[PDB]
Design a protein around this ligand. Structure first.
Ligand code: NA
Length: 85
């Protein structure tokens, strides 16, 4: 199967970060997830907000559990459902 395999999510960063600061931070998270068998593409969309696109969308909730445990993670959104950090 090809279609409906991936899932997009939004990850927000706390404070008033510059785009480059959020970039450094969210990159750390992306790599940690990658190193733990959760592969995702990461795109900056705001100064404090990135899209995490999970290659295996099923993993999005496990990734979310990891993400919200991070100090600079403001929250994660999965399909219009917000999980506060
Ligand atoms: Na906070």
């Amino acid at each position: 199967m090809k279609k409906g395999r991936t899932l997009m999510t939004f990850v927000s960063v706390t404070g008033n970060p510059t785009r480059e600061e959020s970039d450094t931070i969210t990159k750390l998270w992306q790599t940690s997830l990658w190193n733990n068998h959760i592969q995702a593409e990461r795109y900056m969309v705001d100064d404090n907000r990135a899209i995490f696109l999970f290659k295996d969308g099923t993993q999005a909730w496990d990734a979310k559990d990891f993400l919200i445990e991070q100090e600079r993670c403001k929250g994660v959104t999965i399909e219009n459902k917000e999980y506060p950090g």
